[PDB]
Amino acid sequence: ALFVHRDTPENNPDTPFDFTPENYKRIEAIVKNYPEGHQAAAVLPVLDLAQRQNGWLPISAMNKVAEVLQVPPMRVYEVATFYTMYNRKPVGKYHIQVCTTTPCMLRDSDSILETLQRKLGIKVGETTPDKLFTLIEVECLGACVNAPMVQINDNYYEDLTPKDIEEIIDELKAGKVPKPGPRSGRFCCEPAGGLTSLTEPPKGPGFGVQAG
Amino acid sequence: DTTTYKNLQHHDYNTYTFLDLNLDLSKFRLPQPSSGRESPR
Amino acid sequence: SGVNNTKKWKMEFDTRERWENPLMGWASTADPLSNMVLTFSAKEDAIAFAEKNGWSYDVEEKKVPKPKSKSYGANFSWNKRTRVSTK
Amino acid sequence: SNLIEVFVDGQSVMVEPGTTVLQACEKVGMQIPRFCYHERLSVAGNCRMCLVEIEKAPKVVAACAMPVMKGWNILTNSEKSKKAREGVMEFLLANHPLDCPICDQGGECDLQDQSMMFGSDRSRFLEGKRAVEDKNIGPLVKTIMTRCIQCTRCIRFASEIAGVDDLGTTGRGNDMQVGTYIEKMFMSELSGNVIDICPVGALTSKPYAFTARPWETRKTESIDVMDAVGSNIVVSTRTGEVMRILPRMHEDINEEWISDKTR
Amino acid sequence: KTSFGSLKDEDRIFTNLYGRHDWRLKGALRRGDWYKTKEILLKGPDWILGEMKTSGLRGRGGAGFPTGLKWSFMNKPSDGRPKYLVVNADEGEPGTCKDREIMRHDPHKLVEGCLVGGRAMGARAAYIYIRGEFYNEASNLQVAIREAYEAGLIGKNACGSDYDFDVFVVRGAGAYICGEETALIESIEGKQGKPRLKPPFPADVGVFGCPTTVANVETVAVSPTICRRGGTWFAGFGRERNSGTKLFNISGHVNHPCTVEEEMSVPLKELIEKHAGGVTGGWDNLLAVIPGGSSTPLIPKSVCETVLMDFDALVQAQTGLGTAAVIVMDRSTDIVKAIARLIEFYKHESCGQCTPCREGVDWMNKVMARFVKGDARPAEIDSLWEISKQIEGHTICALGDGAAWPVQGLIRHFRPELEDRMQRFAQQ
Numbered sequence A: 001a002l003f004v005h006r007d008t009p010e011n012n013p014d015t016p017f018d019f020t021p022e023n024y025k026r027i028e029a030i031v032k033n034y035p036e037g038h039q040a041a042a043v044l045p046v047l048d049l050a051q052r053q054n055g056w057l058p059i060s061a062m063n064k065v066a067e068v069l070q071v072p073p074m075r076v077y078e079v080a081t082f083y084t085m086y087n088r089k090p091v092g093k094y095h096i097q098v099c100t101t102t103p104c105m106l107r108d109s110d111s112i113l114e115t116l117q118r119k120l121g122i123k124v125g126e127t128t129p130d131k132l133f134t135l136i137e138v139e140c141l142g143a144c145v146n147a148p149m150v151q152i153n154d155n156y157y158e159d160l161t162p163k164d165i166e167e168i169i170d171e172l173k174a175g176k177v178p179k180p181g182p183r184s185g186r187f188c189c190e191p192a193g194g195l196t197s198l199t200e201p202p203k204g205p206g207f208g209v210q211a212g
Numbered sequence B: 001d002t003t004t005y006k007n008l009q010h011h012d013y014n015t016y017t018f019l020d021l022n023l024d025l026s027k028f029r030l031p032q033p034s035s036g037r038e039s040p041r
Numbered sequence C: 001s002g003v004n005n006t007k008k009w010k011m012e013f014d015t016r017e018r019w020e021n022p023l024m025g026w027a028s029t030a031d032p033l034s035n036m037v038l039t040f041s042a043k044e045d046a047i048a049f050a051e052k053n054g055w056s057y058d059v060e061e062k063k064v065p066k067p068k069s070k071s072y073g074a075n076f077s078w079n080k081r082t083r084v085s086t087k
Numbered sequence D: 001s002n003l004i005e006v007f008v009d010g011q012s013v014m015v016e017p018g019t020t021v022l023q024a025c026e027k028v029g030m031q032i033p034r035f036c037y038h039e040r041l042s043v044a045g046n047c048r049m050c051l052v053e054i055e056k057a058p059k060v061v062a063a064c065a066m067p068v069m070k071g072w073n074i075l076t077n078s079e080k081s082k083k084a085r086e087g088v089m090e091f092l093l094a095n096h097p098l099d100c101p102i103c104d105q106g107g108e109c110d111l112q113d114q115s116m117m118f119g120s121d122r123s124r125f126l127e128g129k130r131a132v133e134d135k136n137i138g139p140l141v142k143t144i145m146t147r148c149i150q151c152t153r154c155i156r157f158a159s160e161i162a163g164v165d166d167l168g169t170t171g172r173g174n175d176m177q178v179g180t181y182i183e184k185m186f187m188s189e190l191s192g193n194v195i196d197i198c199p200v201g202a203l204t205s206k207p208y209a210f211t212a213r214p215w216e217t218r219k220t221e222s223i224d225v226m227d228a229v230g231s232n233i234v235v236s237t238r239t240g241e242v243m244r245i246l247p248r249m250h251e252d253i254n255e256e257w258i259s260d261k262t263r
Numbered sequence E: 001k002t003s004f005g006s007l008k009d010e011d012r013i014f015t016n017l018y019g020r021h022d023w024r025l026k027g028a029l030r031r032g033d034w035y036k037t038k039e040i041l042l043k044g045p046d047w048i049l050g051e052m053k054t055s056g057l058r059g060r061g062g063a064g065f066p067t068g069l070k071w072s073f074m075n076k077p078s079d080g081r082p083k084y085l086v087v088n089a090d091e092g093e094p095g096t097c098k099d100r101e102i103m104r105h106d107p108h109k110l111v112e113g114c115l116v117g118g119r120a121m122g123a124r125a126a127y128i129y130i131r132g133e134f135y136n137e138a139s140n141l142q143v144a145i146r147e148a149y150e151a152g153l154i155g156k157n158a159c160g161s162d163y164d165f166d167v168f169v170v171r172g173a174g175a176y177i178c179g180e181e182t183a184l185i186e187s188i189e190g191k192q193g194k195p196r197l198k199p200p201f202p203a204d205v206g207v208f209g210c211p212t213t214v215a216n217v218e219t220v221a222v223s224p225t226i227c228r229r230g231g232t233w234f235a236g237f238g239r240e241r242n243s244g245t246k247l248f249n250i251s252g253h254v255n256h257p258c259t260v261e262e263e264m265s266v267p268l269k270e271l272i273e274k275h276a277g278g279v280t281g282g283w284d285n286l287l288a289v290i291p292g293g294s295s296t297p298l299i300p301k302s303v304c305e306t307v308l309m310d311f312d313a314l315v316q317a318q319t320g321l322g323t324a325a326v327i328v329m330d331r332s333t334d335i336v337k338a339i340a341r342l343i344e345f346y347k348h349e350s351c352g353q354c355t356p357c358r359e360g361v362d363w364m365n366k367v368m369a370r371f372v373k374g375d376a377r378p379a380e381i382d383s384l385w386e387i388s389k390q391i392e393g394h395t396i397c398a399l400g401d402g403a404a405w406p407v408q409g410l411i412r413h414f415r416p417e418l419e420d421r422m423q424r425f426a427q428q
């Protein structure tokens, strides 16, 4: 959105941030995930871990990650500004996302977006005053088949309708985080109208095995 | 059977599943190479 | 980064006193060779012209940039320090 | 030996391996247009202006980064190359702002001259332009970044010659922005060379800001006396005054770069 | 050898693509995984690439390139450097769910594919880059790697074999361009997700400055069973030059959108009638199809009834096969609105390091939004075509091509609609 930082009292280099002891063990594991040199490869996972330990990325975190990696902070800034999953402004306990590309706009995802706006009393990219919900319209998410979908903190709620997102919000507004997946008779990418690709069992080891 | 869904484990995953798993896996993995250098600086 | 205003030799004169006209501030001169600039295609010709017109010259021999070994793959090295960290 | 027979519009040229199309053409007298290649900095094909066709390849190749192969003829004045350059300048001048009589690189702009030689002559961009927030570095450099062209020739200089790593790219797309993500002084003993490196007046020098224009100037070649390096220097004069200091090219000393004291 | 588009469950290569049996080792080990992989590895690298080249397997990513010819680029021996196998699972293109639905419900296939492909090449380890929104899928895959390490299939003695291997899991941060060959590599290395110029090809200097061979999820997941069953078995499916099974995603304006495995060169009409029961309003109501995900042009219904689902066929159709994610329109749809949405997507996901996709994509976004509203004149459509042809080959990566091709398909088949909207706005 902005792609520039101005020192707010909240977001400033003296804003308090540090990793818990377990987070440091996760960091050294992550750095063992990449060679002895070229340890800057851990910028993305370590920065997601920072986003995960505090919910978002203050500049203090974006500098402490450079300190932890011994990398210049500008590279961490470049990374965080490039990738969209890194929240540089604070967001809510539940970060709502809605796909609006053609495979899900062509199934009227905007109906879900309307019924999701009126339920929260917000515009698209706004937050709620209770700091419990935010909202954005985003691009594809890889479940285009179950087209009308949303995403609430690392899980998908798919092929849903206005009733089946009002239900979801009423559950999120009570401490009950509900079950993800298709909110219909389906549970996966299967065709709804009965099995069509396979109903027989799967064959066992050695089936069709080549001579060798 | 092929009459119900059986990947229901991911209804019980927290924020720190992936990284705890990598922390477990770091023991299994080999010592990695080196560029004869601690960093490109 | 253009190099076409090179490729030709020239012949300048030593600059001289420039002062401000007291009326308006215009830069004045008493010499007429202030803006004298000629164009030659070789150094021999300019040396000949200057010797012919009785002027004393001082030469600056040609300056060419070195040919350099450029490689885009050196930006992505494993061992060297050419591994650039941005794009 | 380690040489390669290569053709440039039929004219043969023998060159070492590891070379480029651009060097091979410079060996003949033909320089390809540029907005990202400098010949001291790293290579990065960001402007897509060094696009020439090969005599039978189906497409174009970036000559700043493509190494050459045995038995290649390089067509610099063909129609594919010219169409490529025209498109690239259409793009570059689409979101560019009409600040030519303000921009201190008036008769010093490679964008201007390349639009004037290798480019089209008309805009079919009937939409609105962008605008970028300007940064306050310091008293030397003056960032007007709505007219930048994202060539990275400044961050490359910061990283590879000055050893700084305080300059980068934030965002992606038209909304991407070059500079510091925070208010910071890009202040070093080699910072004023970004003013020359930048082909565009996106960043200029504050002392010279608005004082003169390049055709007014008389360029007398001189040297520095601040330090004992002996850096070759140009002294540009306007009506018996000294307007600015510029570096000369010399590969044994002052490899196109001068300090900030001496400019 | 004609009109061959439907096959049986004996040949289903992703037998658990619906989460009906299991996804862990106890249940994927029953579907024929890790059977004789020890023997496959002890056979040799040349034999695996032979199976690849005989199978006629083209790349199941966007670009269909023959593997074997691709993986053989780093069969050459070690120059004192390691080697790596990077797997592409940044399933960011619209319409695409196949890598998601293999990642969950069948991870051990992918792990065996990594291992076999590495021994086909040489590889100290692998780096499965996966999307960032795919958190739970990545967790299932990490559990699978945990199970394989504990079982004795990866590590110091992988299936015996005196061949040591590791399978790492990198996790992106929400970009579509990172699915490129080299942008994936740069983001692994910990920089901006920006592609590279190619040359240098990733088979000589790639991730960490070391050789690599990027490969889609299913391209590797189908490799070990190809070696275990043979390329000729795999080449029997499809034509002589377009071979294999293929996962097919079907999206939008149809009664049952699903993901299905099916025989290559199947006709698309069979594809939508048999699987994913016919389009909304039936064949009476079809308007157009996008066989690729989004970086492929349209079909005006004249050449989808009698046109095969292949690389060569769709290339002859002025189109192309990508991730084989079919999208369908139903005459209830502003088509310019759809392509403008796709161009908004390409604008959001452009990296921005090369000028054509940095500028012209926003040109075309503005122009197509204007066409949607109708605030243009018909003399701008040819201009838009010219902007497309400028963006096409003068970019670094193929995202400019992918943002230009849909516009070309729209102008090539639905220009009277644009003219109608223009004259409507003019008269009003």
Ligand SMILES: Cc1cc2nc3c(=O)[nH]c(=O)nc-3n(C[C@H](O)[C@H](O)[C@H](O)COP(=O)(O)O)c2cc1C
Binding pocket: E058, E059, E060, E061, E062, E063, E064, E065, E070, E088, E089, E090, E091, E092, E093, E176, E177, E178, E179, E180, E181, E214, E215, E216, E217, E219, E397, E398, E399
């Ligand atoms: C913008 C862009 C996005 C891409 N995204 C993907 C992707 O999400 N998944 C994928 O498998 N390939 C993607 N590709 C193509 C990859 O280059 C390809 O998958 C990889 O090179 C493997 O090639 P293969 O299909 O021959 O195995 C993308 C290419 C571009 C230009």
Ligand code: SF4
Binding pocket: D096, D097, D098, D099, D100, D101, D103, D104, D105, D106, D107, D109, D110, D111, D112, D147, D199, D200, D201, D202
């Ligand atoms: S850089 Fe300055 S002189 Fe060149 S085109 Fe832009 S505004 Fe005009």
Ligand code: SF4
Binding pocket: D148, D149, D150, D151, D152, D153, D154, D155, D178, D197, D198, D199, D200, D202, D203
């Ligand atoms: S500021 Fe100048 S040198 Fe830096 S990217 Fe922009 S145009 Fe290039």
Ligand code: SF4
Binding pocket: E177, E195, E349, E350, E351, E352, E353, E354, E355, E356, E357, E358, E395, E396, E397, E398, E399, E400
């Ligand atoms: S075409 Fe777009 S995404 Fe690809 S390199 Fe160029 S700017 Fe980046």
Ligand code: FES
Binding pocket: A099, A100, A101, A102, A103, A104, A139, A140, A141, A142, A143, A144, A145, A147, A149, E093, E094, E095, E096
């Ligand atoms: S287009 Fe909506 S999830 Fe893919």
Ligand code: FES
Binding pocket: D033, D034, D035, D036, D037, D044, D045, D046, D047, D048, D049, D050, D062, D063, D064, D065
């Ligand atoms: S000079 Fe080659 S892309 Fe810029």
